[PDB]
């Protein structure tokens, strides 16, 4: 626990941000109000580094993309008189390639520098410090099917909070669903991106949960330490290309599941970091044993199958996370 306290310390030195708070706001003003020029585009917004310009189509047409229960067609009729997004349209299927085409497009005729990230990203990251900048339709309407059983925090966040959310907006990235060989260009993938961050942000069973000395739980930390845990063996195993899969993605996904397994506040006492800190861990490694990682939103989109990550980089991870725990976690040392 000296040591995990240790690290969070050597993770807070990071004033840095208050400067580059208001440096990446600036682009992001910048380019929302020259996106807003274009016809396609006029009516973009800013979601509430990871960043979501949101654009929201009314009365979108969803269709189930084959039976990932994650990935999406945008119906959508041509007919709606007078419509900027006509040029992203196939048939009925309005394409998300088109789309990321056009909005990366745009962006990158703004200099007042980018970099395709691998296979899939649905973000543009621009280098400056670096940022993703990601597109994103926004539905009023009522959450997939495939969401039904998600969002499990009736135990842990009230059932109340549960109704609360599933009321908000969701959201489509022009994230593609692989075929194998290759993408389907035009398919999008759901993203509730903005309902992980206020589950994080208001994460106690009790609402004053870190409002005071009294309730100050140590979930944060634990996400923190175990996003962390993962960067540093990434950047020890750089060119394995075993662990180029596992993201900061999944352990939130995991943090989250371990939530869910310990809904009451008192068993996220920072007097019991190191046990906390050592739930996540384990938690995590009967995810890559037993290759089950489900998406905390989506039950059915097993974010750990073999079709994504394979069976050999699961048991490579495995193998050096339990080396971290057995030892005191060595990584955590300096
Ligand atoms: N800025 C940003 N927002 C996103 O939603 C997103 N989704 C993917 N990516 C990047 O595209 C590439 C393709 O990975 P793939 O999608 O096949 O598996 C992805 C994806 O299935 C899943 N995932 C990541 N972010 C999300 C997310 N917000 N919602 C659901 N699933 C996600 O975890 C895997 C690894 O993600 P990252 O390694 O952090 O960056 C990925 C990756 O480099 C994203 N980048
Ligand atoms: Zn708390």
């Known amino acids: ?193 903005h309902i992980e961050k206020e589950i994080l942000n208001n994460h106690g069973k009790s609402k004053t949960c870190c409002e005071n000395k009294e309730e100050k739980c140590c979930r944060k930390d634990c996400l923190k330490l175990m996003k962390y845990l993962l960067e540093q063996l990434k950047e020890r195993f750089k060119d394995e290309e075993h662990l180029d899969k596992f993201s900061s993605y999944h352990v939130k996904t995991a943090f989250f599941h371990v939530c869910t397994q310990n809904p009451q506040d008192s068993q996220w006492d920072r007097k019991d970091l190191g046990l906390c800190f050592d739930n996540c861990v384990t938690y995590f490694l009967q995810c890559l044993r037993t290759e089950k990682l489900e998406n905390y939103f989506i039950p059915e989109f097993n974010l750990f199958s073999s079709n994504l990550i394979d069976k050999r980089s699961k048991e490579f991870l495995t193998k050096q996370i339990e080396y971290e725990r057995n030892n005191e976690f060595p990584v955590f040392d300096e």
């Open 1 to 193: 626990a000296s040591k995990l306290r240790a690290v969070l310390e050597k993770l807070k030195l990071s004033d840095d941000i208050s400067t580059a708070a208001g440096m990446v706001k600036g682009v992001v003003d910048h380019l929302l109000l020259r996106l807003k020029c274009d016809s396609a585009f006029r009516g973009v917004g800013l979601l509430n580094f990871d960043v979501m310009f949101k654009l929201e189509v009314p009365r979108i047409q969803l269709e189930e993309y084959s039976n990932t229960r994650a990935y999406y067609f945008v119906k959508f009729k041509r007919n709606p008189k007078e419509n900027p997004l006509s040029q992203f349209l196939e048939g009925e299927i309005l394409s998300a390639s088109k789309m990321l085409s056009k909005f990366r497009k745009i962006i990158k005729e703004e200099i007042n520098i980018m970099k395709r990230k691998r296979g899939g990203s649905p973000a543009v990251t621009l280098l400056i410090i670096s940022v993703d900048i990601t597109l994103a339709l926004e539905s009023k309407s009522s959450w997939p099917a495939s969401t039904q059983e998600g969002l499990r925090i009736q135990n842990w966040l009230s059932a109340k909070v549960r109704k609360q959310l599933r009321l908000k907006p969701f959201y489509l990235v022009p994230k593609h669903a692989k075929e194998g060989n290759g993408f389907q260009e035009e398919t999008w993938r759901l993203s509730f991106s």
